[PDB]
Amino acid sequence: MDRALFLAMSGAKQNMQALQLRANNLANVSTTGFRADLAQARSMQAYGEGHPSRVFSMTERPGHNFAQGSVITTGRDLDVTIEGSGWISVLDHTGKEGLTRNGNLKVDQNGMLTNASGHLVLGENDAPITLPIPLSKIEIGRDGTISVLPQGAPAEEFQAVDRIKLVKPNDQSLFKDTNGLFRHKTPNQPYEADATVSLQTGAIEGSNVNAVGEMTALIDLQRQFEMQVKMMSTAEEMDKSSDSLLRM
Amino acid sequence: GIPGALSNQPPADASIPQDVAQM
Amino acid sequence: YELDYYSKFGHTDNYGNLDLRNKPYTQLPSGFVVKGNLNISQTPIKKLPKGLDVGGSLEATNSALKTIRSGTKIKGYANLLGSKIESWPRGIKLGGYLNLTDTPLKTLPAKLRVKGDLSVIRTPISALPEGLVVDGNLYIGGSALQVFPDTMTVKGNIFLGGNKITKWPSNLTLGGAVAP
Amino acid sequence: GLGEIRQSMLEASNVNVTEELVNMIEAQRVYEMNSKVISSVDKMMSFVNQQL
Amino acid sequence: MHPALWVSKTGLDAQQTNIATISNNLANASTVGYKKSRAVFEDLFYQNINQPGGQSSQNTELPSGLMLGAGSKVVATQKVHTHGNAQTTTNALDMMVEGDGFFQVTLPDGNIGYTRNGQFTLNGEGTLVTSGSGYPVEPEIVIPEDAISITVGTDGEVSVRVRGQQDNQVVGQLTITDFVNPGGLEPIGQNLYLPTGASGDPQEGVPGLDGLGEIRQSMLEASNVNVTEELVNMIEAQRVYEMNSKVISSVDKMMSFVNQQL
C-alpha cells in the first residue's frame, strides 16, 4: 500500500537468506578442507522519477575465508594437508576438473588414488593417478611426489610413480561450485600445477569456520530482521488509519 | 535548491569513458 | 588545516571515495593518491599538491580551489563550476570534461586536449589557445571571447551562448553545428 | 610381502583414547552451536506471526 | 551492526590469536632449538564522531571532541630469540651454538635456511645432514668410510680419526650465520628460518671470530619456552575472552529490549 511494506519485507527476506548462509558454516565446522562462506549486504537504489528515498538491500557471497584450516594429526600415510595456500586438483563424477582441499586420500581396488569424497586426484600427466595394484608401502612426498614399494620388494626400491598436482591460483578468481569444488570464474582456464605448494603428510586440514564470527553475525541478523518487521507493522497501521478519508 | 541533495539518477562514474566524458 | 594519514581515513568509504564536502581542510599531502572520486567542493583549499593521482572524478564546485600543480592525473572528469581558479596548468592528465562555468579563468595552455565537453561559461578568458582540440561540445556563453583560434577541433556542437564571433577558424572539423 | 606369524602374542587395539576425548569435545560443541541456530530461527519465526 | 558489537569482537579475535600462539609454544616445549613467540596487541584507530572536521585538539575534553576506538588487534607474533639451556647427549653428530649464530642447511628449492637446531646425522653417502627431513648442511662435509670417530672443534673444524696414521685429518669446517635482526626471520617449520627484508642480509663467518658463537659437539640447545609463563598468560587470555563475551550479550539484550518495547 505504501511500498514501505515491501521495502521492509525485501530486507527481512534477505536477512533470512544471510542467516541460512551462516547456518551452513556452523553445520560444516568439522568438514574437511571446508572454506567458510562470507556474507554481506549490498545497497541497490531504485533509480527513477521522484525523491531518492527507496533503496533495497540484498545479500550476496562476496568471497570465502581462504585461511588455513585446523590441522588434525592422524599419523596416516594417505592423509595430507596443504601447507599455507594451495589446492589439490580433482575431477568429480562429471569428469570436470575442480580444486579441493580435502587430502583424506584412499586407494580403491583398482588402485586409483581418490579422496574421501570419491573425486579422482590428478597428477603430473593431468590424468587421474593410478598406482600398481599389489603395493606394500605408500609414502606421499612433501612436494606431492608419490613413491610406492612393490609387494615383497626390498627396502631400497622406493621408486616414484606420480606427483600430486598442487595448484595455487589467486584466491579472488575462484568460486565455490555446486559440489564444493573451487573453479576459475573465467571458464576454459587451465589450472597450472605449482611446484611451490607443500604437503604436510600425516595430517588432515579441518575447516576454518570462526564460530564466534558466525554467532555475532546471527545476533545482528536477528535484530535487523525484527526491526524491519516492525516497519511492516507500522506500514499497515498507517494504511488502516488513512482509510477514514473515504468513510463519509 | 538544497545543497548536497542526492539525485535520483545513476551516479556518473569512471569506467566506460562514456560517463567520464559526457557532461 | 592539513590532511594527515588518519585525517583522510575518516572520509573514505569501502571503494576509496574521498568526501571533503565543507570540511575545514586547506591542503592535501604531497604526492597524494586517491583510489576513487575526490570531492573538495566548498573547501578553503587554495592549491592541490603536486603529484596528485585520482582514480575517479574531481568535484570542486563553489570552492576556493585556485591553483593546480602540473602532473596531476584524473581518471574521470574535473568539475570546477564556481571555483576560484585563474589559470590552468599544462600537463594535466584528464580523462573527462573540464567544467569551468562561473570561474575567473583567464588563460589556457596551448595545444590543450579535452576528451569531453569544455565549459568556459561566464569566464573572463580572452582567447582560446591555438591547437585546442575538444572531443565534445564547446560552451562559451557569457564569456569575453570574441575571436576564435585559427585551428581548433570540436567534435561536438559549438554553443556561442550570445557572444558575437567576429573571426572563425580556418581549419575546423565540426561534427555538429553552431548555436547562438 | 606378507606379514609374519608371531606365537604367544596378540595385537592390541589401535584406538587413541586421547583422540576420542578430543573428538568428543569438538563434536559436543558443534552440536550445541547448531541447536542455538534452530532456537534462533524459531524465535525469529515467532516474532513474525506475533507482531504482524 | 551496532559498532559496540564489532569492537568487542576484535577483542575476541585478538585473544584467539593469543591462544593460538600460546598453544603452539607449549606444543613445542621439548623441540630442540625452538624459540617462543608472544602475541603483541595494539589498539585500533580512534574516530571523531561529534566533529567530522578531524581536529582532535580543539575541544577534546568536550562532547564535540569525543573519539571512540575501534577495538584491538594482534600486530605481530614476536619471536624471543634468547639463548636456551644446554642438553648434554652422547651422540657425536649433534651440535650446539654458544651464543649468537645460525646453522646453514640447503633446502630442496636451492636457497638456504637457517636453524638453531643442531640435531644432525649422516646419509648413505656420508654427508652431514639434518636428523629430520635430511637437508644437507652448508658447507658439505663428507665423512670417509675408514673414519672411526668425528671431532668437531670449537671453530667448526671437522676432523676424523683414522687408524694407521696419527693426527686427525681435517675434512671440513663448519660456518654459521648471524643476522642484525634475527627476530625478523620467517619461520617455515621443520626448525628452519628463511631470511627476510626485516632480518637483514646474512652475515657469514667462522664460528668463534667476529663475535660469533662456538660450536659445541655432543650438546643440544633446549627450547627457551617458559611453561609457567604460558600458563599465566593462558589464564589472562581466557578471562579477557570471557569479558568480551559478556558485553556482546549485553549489547544483544539491550537491542532486543528496543524492538520488544518500542
Q: How far is CA C167 from CA A32, A203, C153, C158, in A?
A: 79, 84, 15, 14
Cβ distance E218 to E88 under 8 Å? yes
Give the burial string for A8-33 (b: 16+ CB within 10 Å, else e). Answer: beebbebbbebbebbbebbebbbbbb
Q: Does E48 touch chain C (CB under 8 A)?
A: yes
Q: Which residue of A has its CA nearest to D26?
A: A30
Preceding-residue numbers of gaps in chain B (C–N over 2.5 Å): none
Q: State the Cα–Cα distance between residues C110 and C57, nearest whole angstrom.
A: 24
* E261 SS3 class: helix
Among all chains, which residue has been given the C-alpha cell 616445549?
A: E29
Q: How far is CA C13 from CA B3, C10, C18, E6, E40, in A?
A: 21, 8, 7, 18, 29
In chain A, what residues touch B12 (CB-CB under 8 Å)?
A: none
Cβ distance C99 to C77 under 8 Å? yes
The three cell numbers of residue A183 are 573453479
Cβ distance A2 to A23 under 8 Å? no
Nearest to A119 by CA among A72, A142, A87: A87
Cβ distance E127 to E134 under 8 Å? no
Cβ distance C97 to C136 under 8 Å? yes
* Number of Cβ within a 10 Å radius of residue E24: 15
The packing angle between helices D17-51 and A211-241, to 10°, is: 10
Cβ distance E66 to E49 under 8 Å? yes
Kindly give, in sequence order, each residue whose CB lies less than 8 Å from that of residue E63, ignoring residues fewer than 6 positions away: E50
* Number of Cβ within a 10 Å radius of residue C167: 10
Nearest to A146 by CA among A168, A122, A167, A169: A122
Among all chains, which residue has been given the C-alpha cell 577558424?
A: C169
The packing angle between helices E227-261 and E3-27, to 10°, is: 160
Q: State the Cα–Cα distance between residues C35 and C15, nearest whole angstrom.
A: 8
Q: Which residue of E has its CA nearest to C1?
A: E55
Q: State the Cα–Cα distance between residues A135 and A157, nearest whole angstrom.
A: 12
Q: Does D34 touch chain A (CB under 8 A)?
A: yes
* Number of Cβ within a 10 Å radius of residue E165: 8
Say which experimental method was used.
cryo-EM
Nearest to A105 by CA among A150, A138, A66: A138
Contacts made by residues C29-38, CB under 8 angstroms, sequence distance 24+: C29/C2, C29/C3, C29/C4, C29/C5, C32/C3, C36/B14, C37/B13, C37/B14, C37/C76
Distance (Å) from the C-alpha of residue A43 to the closest C-alpha of chain B?
A: 13
Nearest to C57 by CA among C42, C41, C79, C40: C79
For residue C174, how far is the Cα from the chain centroid? 22
CB-CB under 8 Å, A30 with D30: yes
Distance (Å) from the C-alpha of residue A53 to the closest C-alpha of chain B?
A: 9
> Widest CA span of chain C, in angstroms?
55
Q: State the Cα–Cα distance between residues E146 and E189, nearest whole angstrom.
A: 36
Q: Does E110 touch chain C (CB under 8 A)?
A: no
Cβ distance A166 to A138 under 8 Å? no
The three cell numbers of residue C84 are 576560484
Chains E and A lie in contact, requiring 3 or more CB pairs less than 8 Å apart: yes
Resolution (A): 3.5
CB-CB under 8 Å, E52 with C23: yes
Residue A130: strand pairing partners: A112
Q: What is the DSSP letter of C9?
A: G
Among all chains, which residue has been given the C-alpha cell 504482524?
A: D52
Q: State the Cα–Cα distance between residues E190 and A89, nearest whole angstrom.
A: 26
Kindly give, in sequence order, each residue whose CB lies less than 8 Å from that of residue C132, ignoring residues fewer than 6 positions away: C108, C110, C111, C112, C149, C152, C153
Chains near D (3 or more Cβ pairs under 8 Å) = A
Kindly give, in sequence order, each residue whose CB lies less than 8 Å from that of residue A210, ignoring residues fewer than 6 positions away: A36, A65, E13
Cβ distance A229 to D43 under 8 Å? no
Of E108, E256, E262, the CB nearest to A223: E256
Peptide bond into A128 cis (omega under 30): no
Distance (Å) from the C-alpha of residue E197 to the closest C-alpha of chain C?
A: 25
- The per-residue DSSP string of A176-193 comes to E-TTS-EEESSSS-----
Q: State the Cα–Cα distance between residues E231 and E220, nearest whole angstrom.
A: 25
In chain E, what residues touch C6 (CB-CB under 8 Å)?
A: 45
Q: Which residue of D has its CA nearest to A232?
A: D52
Kindly give, in sequence order, each residue whose CB lies less than 8 Å from that of residue C101, ignoring residues fewer than 6 positions away: C81, C82, C119, C120, C121, C122, C123, C139
Nearest to E133 by CA among E142, E121, E143, E145: E121
CB-CB under 8 Å, C116 with B20: yes
Chains D and C lie in contact, requiring 3 or more CB pairs less than 8 Å apart: no
Q: State the Cα–Cα distance between residues B22 and C77, nearest whole angstrom.
A: 9
In chain A, what residues touch E248 (CB-CB under 8 Å)?
A: 216, 219
Among all chains, which residue has been given the C-alpha cell 582560446?
A: C128
Q: State the Cα–Cα distance between residues E52 and C102, nearest whole angstrom.
A: 29
- The per-residue DSSP string of E147-179 comes to --EEEE-TT-EEEEE-TTSSSPEEEEE--EEE-
C112: phi > 0 → left, psi -120 to 50 → alpha, else beta; which? beta
Q: State the Cα–Cα distance between residues E176 and D41, nearest whole angstrom.
A: 62
Kindly give, in sequence order, each residue whose CB lies less than 8 Å from that of residue A35, ignoring residues fewer than 6 positions away: A64, A65, A66, A101, A176, A182, A207, A208
Query: Residue C54: phi, psi to the nearest 5?
Result: -115, 125
